[PDB]
Design a protein around this ligand. Structure first.
Ligand SMILES: Nc1nc2c(ncn2[C@@H]2O[C@H](COP(=O)(O)OP(=O)(O)OP(=O)(O)O)[C@@H](O)[C@H]2O)c(=O)[nH]1
Ligand SMILES: Nc1nc2c(ncn2[C@@H]2O[C@H](COP(=O)(O)OP(=O)(O)OP(=O)(O)O)[C@@H](O)[C@H]2O)c(=O)[nH]1
Ligand SMILES: Nc1nc2c(ncn2[C@@H]2O[C@H](COP(=O)(O)OP(=O)(O)O)[C@@H](O)[C@H]2O)c(=O)[nH]1
Ligand SMILES: Nc1nc2c(ncn2[C@@H]2O[C@H](COP(=O)(O)OP(=O)(O)O)[C@@H](O)[C@H]2O)c(=O)[nH]1
Ligand SMILES: [Mg+2]
Ligand SMILES: [Mg+2]
Lengths: 428, 428, 68, 428, 431
């Protein structure tokens, strides 16, 4: 029951999809051959939320890899855990991506959708009770920003009642992985505002600082960044996969977070994060978990909470612990820095808990929060978009695909409506 | 699967074709006798039914005196004999003969070779054009060949690594003429055109490599290092894989501005490697150094409309974003307002390869920079002066108008430069 | 000659997947009257009495509007 | 009891029949020597539906191989299973067919009927209780199409109460194996509208799709496609040959299928089909059989059922399974995507089951669909006919055999009326 | 049961028959002395009481100087000497001599020999006629033979492979007359005609085989390869067998249009073979390439009306289908509108055989494409313009009028050729 299908579309999508399925596989004790080698029956009780049984007792992930130019797919197949995916669940086109939203959404998306959806349906029927969909996007690139939104639109029409979730990697404030990032951003955010129910924004800048200062790493590879992201993605469905003295389904998480249908851009963080030196010094207690999680540094996106107001927040704990302490810590926080919280919400946090920690750990905690400091990213993005669009740089590339300019102005107005909505409820 | 087509025109095109194709045969362990003692060589080759790997290139020229050397050199078992195309007589440093008299009865003979050379590709990225602007075959056949491609392929990506007439060092008197006529002919037909001068690479050989007896076989070895560093993502794994389609999109603002600069770092002798450490920050600093530019243009007189970076070797992504941030803090470097972005980046886990008998040094970090600066309006203007200087008496014209040209094609080709000159200022 | 849409097998019959990057000839598919006007639409029915316009040896027999 | 007599006309029929009798014979454990070497007593009970006892315990098939230019019979008469046939069931003419429907129907066919009919009767009376006929065709050539239909009209009148199937392979939409194909098609269709009870249509092209899109084969041969056609043909007579908790005779399969006497064209598909790598992941249950068969890819004909509506359908499951799942599954489909099923037929599927799966499997199925998308074969053929019949091309070859002209239009009008019947009942 | 009869008339007829038979004996293991150390040789041969395989061909000519080379060569134990037919005097490049004066004395024995040769046949498929239009014997005597064969058999199928008078390279001056005369004579009687030109095959030998000095024997080797490929499906197994009637029906649209081009691929040298891969897509692209046409016609000046392809060796039907679909999608190939279809494909498992001391290379895939295009209007226009330029002055006409003709035969032939080129224009014109 409560099955979940997983989508990764793009280079960044497909690469973090590798780490995510490696983290989950180690959680439930399955080898890259697909066989099971865990000990408890807890690994086998709710394996069906992500995997499908096979002959001889194998568990294949319920994932889809969609990406043009299968180069990165050939890599993840050559990876250690590339033997687990069904070769059927690969969708690729021989053409190039272009780092372009248009041809991702209009030309080559158009021919891949025929096969992507048939793959989606044939595995969504295997579910006895579909909970929702989750995707891994990257708003800079062309495939992710173009195929992903086209896929989400189709998904929302074919399954509107369910929950589609997004871990979108947004552009970075100072460094820019590509040059047409603003155009790729707005044209995707304009699609996200109508067709998304939950969308956590991540930024590589925030990931770099956490990996540099806190984790004290010296050569943070994208393998490590995705080990971070894979950790925080797994930390959401712990209530689904494992028992808990206060469990929290995915649906009730949104119900408590988003007060309005359009404010679904969250902000995440994981705890605990220590160096190899400080693992000896600092303890593992709930006050420790909550002190690091509320910090303005664990925010995996480059938004500053001290500038905005928290609409809602959420915490998910893992490890046999005392549920009075968590309720006390979250209340204590609200009373202390009360100005950062809205007043017409009495108690604006939810708190889950799971009796099952990560594999090698004993206490962990994961954070989600819907702040009004998220509007800053959209202001910075909207500013860069209008600066380039006022002169029509790189525009012949988009209009060469049957796009017009109303599709840009519509996108920019819809992003301007969103940033004003966030400004209203930010009463400073 | 990730396949390209490499074209070499004129003597320079073939004189670099020996350099690059000596590099790849070395970069994939390919013996000069075709065979070796997948998805790696398939970018540049075609594994026949038994053993041998044929390159997917075509050496086109009119003088027999260069292509026969290849037919007798050590790299004679390599090439399919029909690919190496050679005529009886040459265009004789004359744009007309390469465009109206001789070129017209060999293009279709080349096209039939290109036709059969594009079908065996299962996924095509784009054509690579090596040109020699300033001669007859390079400037005449080249421009005539591209138009025949633009009607046959149209949307495909054709790059141009066109060596260009140097300001001071010059081995021709009429080269201002057949250069102007070349641009106006390729301007509307090439997708993006890199520039590079023989003098700018001479000083590189003087300061850095410290070779005081430089020859062309010391320059062509520097160009192969660029492309091997540019097409690593096509055939080697590594983070931030980047193909050619995504290369022209976020680099060419308007359909006109596609003349770009190039660089490379490090470039050191065998011994100073034992005097250095070559940190990634030091590399990209020297990559933006005007002294490390492969064109005799000065960027500190203009502004940057875009940049493209290809790193290679032991590089991790945090430092690319860390050091680029520093360059954006420096003030010697400017950026036109309507592109706050501008840094497409790329990584590869395969360090550059060294050639036995070469002059570079075994290293583990490298950067190949490609930028679209507006200062490229200076090297453009001189060609418009020397053309206008000689055209006032119409010297040497009785040769062009003797081989099927009239006065139209001169003023026609002269205005476009004026139109392009103001275009390089309208962007300011 | 024309190319009639093979509906379920119409994918994998573009020029691209057949290793042809040479600006495909589409008029062979566009002369047809398919529903959506493209490769994926179904065509239209007829009455089917099928007159002649030509005698035994070719040579369009009447004043049939023809391209010289 | 329930005997079946089998015809193979034309080159195609003489080659599909090769694999067919190789498949069925192995299913009953009989050697190419004709001797029984199976194990169970189940094979011996209904062996007489296809074979006849002979001295020494040999079992010769109840087949009839007829063809002009017996060259192709020399192949099968020399194959591994070519020693089982009776030599008197080899009817052939010394001359050739010529891919000409006329002489395959009027001149040369007529000189063979006097002999063929003595062959069909002498082994239609040896049947104590004749069930029906079955033939294998090819609507392209002359022998299979011409002699095929001419044989039918003789059979239709001699044995009007018995049932006549036709596994006719029809022309392909995009590549035609013959040029005169549309002429030969309609002139045969005009015979099958009136002289056929059931007519399964197949396309060599859609067979290629299933062959490398589902089976993911590398070098498909006609020997492998016939291993597909012979799998569905064998999948029909299971209820005749093997016991089952819900049997389905051949006659009851028609009455439940065709509502009106003219719509006797179907489309078939087989299940399960996996690669050599997929059998490791996918499981074999009824929900899998019921989605791969209902999909719009296993349809062995080149007609997309999603462009029409299903009138009725069928399914012949094989293997000890739960007869509820089959009942509720075929129910669930009609309810989910109700747009593809007609309304004035509430429950428009029939479901049989056999306790005996294929020789090497544990569960399997077989599908028969009577959709209104079958008209698409008739539109595409109608135009290709009129485009060249209005010009009188390739026609002097048909009047050479004294054929008339109205025999072309009547054959066409009969079609263009059949294409409308399929549309009245398609209220979209 | 699958038996054909071969006729080699004129000099070039037997010049290419020698190559074809050196090919067939080697392909079927037949030593030059008739016998070898079933149903595989029966297409071309007949077994005597013990071991001897005599070929079912006929070599007809009027010069003893070539039939005697054949009689004295190593291939002298093969033929029944009554098959090798020669005459005392030759036609001397004169249609009138070949038709009215000389050939009418030996038609009687040629026909009774053809009767005796077709008697032993059980199932006769058709008559192959290797002719060389341009020389009196070839032209006139083949016209006379074909008229007699049509009145005798009629129902049988006649393929004629006619070495056609060439545009520029020509070893004669009067041949524009006898070419028109032979066409006007045989048009009503041949069932299909395959044209091929010495200049085109010279160009092929130049560009592909790297041979620069072909002495009329490389061309014959190529023609032998072509016929072996074309008649494989008669004596070799393989999917999609194709015989003569199937070959002609779906290829000849109108009673007039029955002349067609030809091609072959791959055709390479023993080193480019070893340094190439020759996939089926490359093979079909090279076949449909104009520069591979065995005749001096450019198909891009017209529109195809049908094509026939015979793949040999390691070929699969899906690959054939995909390559034909790619050709259709291509833009430089045109097709006259009234044929939405247009390809008759066949496969054979037997790869093409190679000869000792030959010049081709051992391959495993090969294609012999045969198309009926509306571009041979250009070669008919060439021939008619040359006949016109000459007959405007009554040049050489006294020879033809003295050797038993009159003038009206020139006007009949010229009007027939004008009508034929108007046909090739009209039947291609679209509404
Ligand atoms: N980088 C590099 N440049 C070269 C080389 N050889 C020549 N060049 C330059 O190329 C330009 C002319 O080279 P060519 O290829 O001979 O000119 P062309 O197109 O062949 O015209 P024709 O000589 O008339 O046939 C000059 O500016 C040369 O300096 C070389 O080996 N390497
Ligand atoms: N492909 C090929 N063509 C040949 C050959 N020998 C001659 N030809 C051509 O055939 C034409 C002449 O035909 P012939 O057979 O020699 O003349 P003829 O028909 O015997 O008439 P007479 O000479 O009067 O007896 C010329 O155009 C030759 O180029 C050959 O061996 N191979
Ligand atoms: N966590 C993580 N993010 C990446 C990685 N590679 C790329 N990204 C981001 O992916 C963004 C560009 O999108 P990309 O997937 O590479 O191109 P696309 O194929 O057009 O979607 C860039 O902003 C990169 O920063 C990676 O390896 N790990
Ligand atoms: N599944 C299958 N189809 C074939 C085979 N051979 C021919 N066909 C089809 O049969 C058609 C030609 O009809 P053909 O049997 O040769 O003419 P006939 O002798 O008059 O029946 C073509 O469309 C072929 O594609 C085969 O071996 N297997
Ligand atoms: Mg030169
Ligand atoms: Mg002669």
């Amino acid at each position: 029951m409560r099955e979940i299908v997983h989508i990764q579309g793009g280079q960044c999508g497909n690469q973090i999809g590798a780490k995510f399925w490696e983290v989950v596989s180690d959680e439930h004790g399955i080898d890259p051959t697909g066989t099971y080698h865990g000990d408890s029956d807890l690994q086998l009780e709710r394996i069906n939320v992500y995997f499908n049984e096979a002959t001889g007792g194998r568990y294949v992930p319920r994932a889809i890899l969609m990406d043009l130019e299968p180069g990165t797919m050939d890599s993840v197949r050559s990876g250690p855990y590339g033997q687990i995916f069904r070769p059927d669940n690969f969708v690729f086109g021989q053409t190039g991506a272009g780092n372009n939203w248009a041809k991702g959404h209009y030309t080559e998306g158009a021919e891949l959708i025929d096969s992507v959806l048939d793959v989606v349906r044939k595995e969504a029927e295997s579910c006895d009770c579909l909970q929702g969909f989750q995707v891994c996007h990257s708003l800079g690139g062309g495939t992710g920003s173009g195929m992903g939104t086209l896929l989400i639109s189709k998904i929302r029409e074919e399954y509107p009642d369910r929950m589609m979730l997004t871990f979108s990697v947004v552009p970075s404030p100072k460094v820019s992985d590509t040059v047409v990032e603003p155009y790729n951003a707005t044209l995707s955010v304009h699609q996200l505002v109508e067709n998304a129910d939950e969308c956590m924004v991540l930024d590589n800048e925030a990931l770099y600082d956490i990996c540099f200062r806190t984790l004290k790493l010296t050569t943070p590879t994208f393998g490590d960044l995705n080990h971070l992201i894979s950790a925080v993605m797994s930390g959401i469905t712990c209530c689904l996969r494992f028992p808990g003295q206060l469990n929290a389904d995915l649906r009730k998480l949104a119900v408590n977070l988003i007060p309005f249908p359009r404010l679904h851009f969250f902000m995440v963080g994981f705890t605990p994060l220590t160096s190899r030196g400080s693992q000896q010094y600092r303890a593992l207690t709930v006050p420790e978990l909550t002190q690091q999680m509320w910090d303005a540094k664990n925010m995996m996106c480059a938004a500053d909470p001290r500038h905005g107001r928290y609409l809602t927040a959420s915490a998910l704990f893992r490890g046999r612990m005392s549920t009075k302490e968590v309720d006390e810590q979250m209340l204590n926080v609200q009373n202390k820095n009360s100005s950062y919280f809205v007043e017409w919400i009495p108690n604006n946090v939810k708190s889950s808990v799971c009796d099952i920690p990560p594999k090698g750990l004993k206490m962990s905690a994961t954070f989600i929060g819907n702040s009004t400091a998220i509007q800053e990213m959209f202001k910075r993005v909207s500013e860069q978009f209008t600066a380039m669009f006022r002169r029509k740089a790189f525009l012949h590339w988009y209009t060469g695909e049957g796009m017009d300019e109303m599709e840009f102005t519509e996108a920019e107005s819809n992003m301007n409506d969103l940033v004003s909505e966030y400004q209203q409820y930010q009463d400073a | 699967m990730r396949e390209v087509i490499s074209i070499h025109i004129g003597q320079a095109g073939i004189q670099v074709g020996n350099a690059c194709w000596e590099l790849y045969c070395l970069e994939h362990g390919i013996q000069p006798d075709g065979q070796m003692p997948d998805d790696a060589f398939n970018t540049f080759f075609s594994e026949t039914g038994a053993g041998k790997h044929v390159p997917r290139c075509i050496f086109l020229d009119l003088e027999p005196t260069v292509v026969d050397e290849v037919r007798t050199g050590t790299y004679r078992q390599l090439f399919h004999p029909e690919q190496l195309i050679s005529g009886k007589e040459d265009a004789a440093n004359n744009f007309a003969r390469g465009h109206y008299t001789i070129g017209k009865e060999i293009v279709d003979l080349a096209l039939d070779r290109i036709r059969k050379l594009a079908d065996n590709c299962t996924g095509l990225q784009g054509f690579l054009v090596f040109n020699a602007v300033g001669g007859g075959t390079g400037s005449g056949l080249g421009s005539l060949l591209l138009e025949r491609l633009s009607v046959d392929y149209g949307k495909k990506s054709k790059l141009g690594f066109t060596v260009y007439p140097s300001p001071q060092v010059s081995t021709a008197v009429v080269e201002p003429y057949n250069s102007v006529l070349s641009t106006h002919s390729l301007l509307e037909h090439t997708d993006v055109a890199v520039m590079l001068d023989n003098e700018a690479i001479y000083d590189i050989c003087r300061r850095s490599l410290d070779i005081e007896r430089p020859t062309y076989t010391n320059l062509n070895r520097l160009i192969a290092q660029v492309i091997s560093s540019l097409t690593a993502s096509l055939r080697f794994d590594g983070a931030l894989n980047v193909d050619i389609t995504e290369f022209q999109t976020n680099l060419v603002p308007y359909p006109r501005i596609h003349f770009m600069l190039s660089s490379y770092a490090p470039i050191i002798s065998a011994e100073k490697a034992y005097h250095e450490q070559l940190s990634v920050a030091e590399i990209t600093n020297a990559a933006f150094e005007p002294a490390s530019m492969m064109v005799k243009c000065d960027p500190r007189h203009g502004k940057y409309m875009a940049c493209c970076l290809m790193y290679r070797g032991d590089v991790v992504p945090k430092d690319v974003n860390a050091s680029v941030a520093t360059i954006k803090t420096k003030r010697t470097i400017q950026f036109v307002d309507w592109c706050p972005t501008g840094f497409k980046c790329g990584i590869n886990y395969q360090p550059p390869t060294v050639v036995p008998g070469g002059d570079l040094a075994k290293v583990q970090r490298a950067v190949c920079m490609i930028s679209n600066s507006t200062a490229i309006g200076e090297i453009f203007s001189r060609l418009d002066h020397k053309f206008d200087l000689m055209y006032a008496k119409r010297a040497f014209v009785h040769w062009y108008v003797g081989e099927g040209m009239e006065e139209g094609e001169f003023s026609e080709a002269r205005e476009d430069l004026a139109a392009l000159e103001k275009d390089f200022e309208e962007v300011g | 000659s024309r190319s009639y849409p093979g509906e379920q097998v119409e994918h994998a019959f573009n020029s691209k997947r057949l290793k042809n990057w040479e600006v495909p000839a589409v008029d062979k598919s566009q002369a047809i009257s398919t529903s959506t006007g493209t490769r994926f639409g179904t065509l239209q029915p007829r009455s089917g009495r099928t007159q002649f316009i030509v005698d035994d040896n070719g040579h369009l027999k009447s004043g049939v509007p023809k391209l010289e």
